[PDB]
Design a protein around this ligand. Sequence first.
Ligand SMILES: *Cc1cc2c(cc1C)nc1c(=O)[nH]c(=O)nc-1n2C[C@H](O)[C@H](O)[C@H](O)COP(=O)(O)OP(=O)(O)OC[C@H]1O[C@@H](n2cnc3c(N)ncnc32)[C@H](O)[C@@H]1O
Ligand SMILES: *Cc1cc2c(cc1C)nc1c(=O)[nH]c(=O)nc-1n2C[C@H](O)[C@H](O)[C@H](O)COP(=O)(O)OP(=O)(O)OC[C@H]1O[C@@H](n2cnc3c(N)ncnc32)[C@H](O)[C@@H]1O
Ligand SMILES: Cc1ccc(NC(=O)c2coc3ccccc3c2=O)cc1C
Ligand SMILES: Cc1ccc(NC(=O)c2coc3ccccc3c2=O)cc1C
Lengths: 495, 500
Amino acid sequence: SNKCDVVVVGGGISGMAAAKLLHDSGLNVVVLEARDRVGGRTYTLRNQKVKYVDLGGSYVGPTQNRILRLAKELGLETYKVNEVERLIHHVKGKSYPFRGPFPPVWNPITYLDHNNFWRTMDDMGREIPSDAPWKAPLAEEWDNMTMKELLDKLCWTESAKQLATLFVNLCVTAETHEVSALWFLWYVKQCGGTTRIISTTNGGQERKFVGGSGQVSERIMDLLGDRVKLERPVIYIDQTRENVLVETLNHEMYEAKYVISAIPPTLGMKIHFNPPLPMMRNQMITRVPLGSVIKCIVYYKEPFWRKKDYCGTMIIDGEEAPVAYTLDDTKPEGNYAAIMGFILAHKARKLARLTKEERLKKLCELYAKVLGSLEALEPVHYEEKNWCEEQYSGGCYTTYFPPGILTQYGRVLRQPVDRIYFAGTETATHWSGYMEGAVEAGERAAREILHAMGKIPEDEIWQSEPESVDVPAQPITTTFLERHLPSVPGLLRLI
Amino acid sequence: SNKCDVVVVGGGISGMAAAKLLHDSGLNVVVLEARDRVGGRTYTLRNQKVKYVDLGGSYVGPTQNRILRLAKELGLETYKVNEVERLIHHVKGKSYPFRGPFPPVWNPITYLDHNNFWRTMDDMGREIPSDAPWKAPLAEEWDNMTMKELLDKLCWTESAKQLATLFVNLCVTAETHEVSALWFLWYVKQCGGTTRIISTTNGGQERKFVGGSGQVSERIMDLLGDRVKLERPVIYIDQTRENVLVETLNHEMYEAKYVISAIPPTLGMKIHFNPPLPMMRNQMITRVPLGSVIKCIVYYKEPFWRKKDYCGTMIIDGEEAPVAYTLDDTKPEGNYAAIMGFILAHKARKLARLTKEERLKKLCELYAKVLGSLEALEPVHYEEKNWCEEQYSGGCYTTYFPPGILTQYGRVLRQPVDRIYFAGTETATHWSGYMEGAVEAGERAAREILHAMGKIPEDEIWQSEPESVDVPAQPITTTFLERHLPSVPGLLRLIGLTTI
Ligand SMILES: *Cc1cc2c(cc1C)nc1c(=O)[nH]c(=O)nc-1n2C[C@H](O)[C@H](O)[C@H](O)COP(=O)(O)OP(=O)(O)OC[C@H]1O[C@@H](n2cnc3c(N)ncnc32)[C@H](O)[C@@H]1O
Ligand SMILES: *Cc1cc2c(cc1C)nc1c(=O)[nH]c(=O)nc-1n2C[C@H](O)[C@H](O)[C@H](O)COP(=O)(O)OP(=O)(O)OC[C@H]1O[C@@H](n2cnc3c(N)ncnc32)[C@H](O)[C@@H]1O
Ligand SMILES: Cc1ccc(NC(=O)c2coc3ccccc3c2=O)cc1C
Ligand SMILES: Cc1ccc(NC(=O)c2coc3ccccc3c2=O)cc1C
């Protein structure tokens, strides 16, 4: 067998970040990666037609200081996603251009309803601890409802309910009826709230990495050299003896003092454990699916939308549209003009039956309607990735919690099992679901092991991160009216 | 490689029934079983204090003709669970004895609400095809709500909502907010409806096997000889070549024409697939958890409850009660007096933290109160099994579907993947979740392979079963008033219209 200090299962950002921290501390680490590549739910494709394109995770933004710091250390730079010109909200077959993060609403009743919806999501989030959402005062009540039930109670207008539904679908690649209200409200709150999570400028979608996000994992693999073993799916972990034994599908055996599991929680099912996992983890890893998304990038000769004072952001309501949300994917130089779109949740399942060429046609025709331009019908290239088909991801962007699961099983997610510690973005407390969360969790799991070895004190397990000098955060603000305008039933109680 | 016609993954009733059918038809079969035993979600413990006891699946009843025929062919016999004396409904800290399958309800408004609840569950069920629940006219609407939401709409009394909640918890070992309304409605309908599923006499809980249900799987293993390989967990299936390659954890390779996967759907995750599974199955197997239950058997010197004219059945509502349902588990000879109880859904998670001795004490104290009997505090022995801890089951009794999953992913549950066919009780269309469904699915999977091999025509894949001569099925009947009495909102409409 191959002996080392720590085996890290999974060579995504989380596993790589954990392995780098342990390596830098002087431990001998091995990373066992199932695929013939690193990066996991990140994947940057290079060819002459696109130069490079993120087909998985791409965006980073203010308050995501760990990913920004790690990438900077590895020699990467960011550029801003184009938001110079107007955004579009396409509603009932018409495009309404706008500025600022939220589409305007003109009907006074609809206005009150929309304002109340966003405000209430943040009000509720303030009572949910980031590190322990199951300790929310109404944890059980909120966990036993779906997001669909919550939106049905909160939204007096169909307009607000359709936009709220789109929000859930885009944020967590799942249907409102599939997900726990508690979990979803935690998810938003732990990215800094509604404004921060939905915003391009000053939010989660502000920036991309020059040359692609895949470079984070690739460049850590570059540092680690042959410590990274590709095409080594872990099948078996045995903790009955002095050292932990980790076996791969290609018949290799690794021996270590500790293990970090840096895979999505449910993919723990692909590993046979000796002794068996404790009851609560055994059942938890069957209760935590990942969402469904096809990421699609359509290329054009020029970023023609800019000529009509549109930035390329489209927010597209309704069942018929294949794609509910787009961003401009053009490179910083104004070349490789492109629109990135997501085919979300049930639509990913529905439209996966089509051919690549059939999806291209539907997207181009949609974009022609929304951008009001025949130029959208003349694509020069197309790339896509359906994450639902990946054996070693399970989906994208991340794991969702159905009703009842987070309160009953959430405490087990990052609880060590003897000498196995748990990384992965699902275990983060700030931007869980994102590349930022992957870094937080990997570095925390690594430091749990450093503490178990006696190398650092307990109070160094969780570590704050200085703010990025390159991507500083501006405060999230609200207006007096936003804070104090009544809800729809509030206006009725006054009548 | 060890060569054969068909590799069956899993030695539970479904895999063993499939293997038997294939073997009897002249094929060479191998059964690869992860555990050191066959039976899976069935397990019959034997020791001198209990003689034998079913710690997993136990009950069979009228309309479950496949398991009865299989068991009979293997030389097994049934006996009737004791329902001679009165049942007990324990609610708000008091016990109310009764006869008939449902506790009687006296308050007229509450009676209308209860009657409408059960009626409506069956009414909705009739809209749902047993073999394609996603084809129900309102499949989407019903699949996008939980059972909690449906009970909140349907039940105009707390009395009905509480009993309905216990019904869901007991039937599918899951909370009302955890499960899809469409899936639960399908599940009940495919067992023959509310009366059949809840009943002891004339229903699902009527009988047990003399000597334990584990004998079904054991006796098939005896017939198959060394074709059953114990402690062979499957880790890898490769369909890239002419013959299917199946690899086990202990480093053996098996080569076959076809494979039957006879394991719970989510446990497919423990196998690495080459090529990868198609998208819909890849995601489906991450979306289908099993329920949570501890099965607990408390032994006594005598079946003392019978002397108070109680049969041993207790239907126990309330958060403080660890166990919501009991049955008399005394042997047919009248010795090894015992009460079987289930600790359900969240309570299985909550009470797992205690010791065995602490759980025994809580159960005895509950039974003493419910039975009004100090004798319940004098147990002579205890056995239990927490199915939540089983790596190779995932839970019990069966797989549940959360909201939204059955309409999006249900169609791939028994869809073949190249040369892999799918058995397991989860893929049945009649008593899915039960030993019966395991037999149906195993035999159906085997015959899919026989059809693929050109050995039988397509119309023999699905095969009806003759009614048991030993366990005749009384029909499910209603009264005129049961059919036509209004719901609570229907009564309110009638009142509004009169007064107009
Ligand atoms: C898919 C996706 C993700 C995504 C998104 C859009 C799409 C289409 N957009 C994002 C965005 O704009 N900004 C952002 O910050 N995140 C975005 N996401 C999510 C993001 O990609 C993820 O949060 C992050 O990449 C997750 O990182 P983590 O390291 O936690 O997880 P992973 O990437 O899945 O890596 C796990 C690795 O483990 C390997 N594996 C799996 N099973 C095994 C076994 N048995 N043995 C050995 N290795 C295993 C995987 O192959 C993978 O490499
Ligand atoms: C657990 C339980 C079940 C149960 C019940 C009460 C409890 C506590 N009460 C029942 C009842 O009264 N009447 C009834 O008809 N059913 C009842 N249930 C359900 C019943 O036990 C199940 O429906 C039935 O036994 C399921 O049979 P099936 O053959 O479909 O599935 P299984 O028993 O789980 O068998 C699967 C076998 O596969 C093995 N396995 C798992 N993974 C692997 C891998 N990777 N490789 C090889 N083998 C694998 C398992 O070990 C098992 O033996
Ligand atoms: C009006 C509006 C604008 C942007 C958004 N965006 C989001 O919520 C996003 C949430 O998480 C993401 C994760 C990966 C990539 C993109 C996103 C979002 O844009 C939502 C609404 C309702
Ligand atoms: C009044 C009453 C009596 C029995 C039941 N029982 C049930 O629903 C059961 C359904 O599934 C089972 C599965 C395995 C073992 C036992 C059972 C039940 O008793 C329910 C009610 C509401």
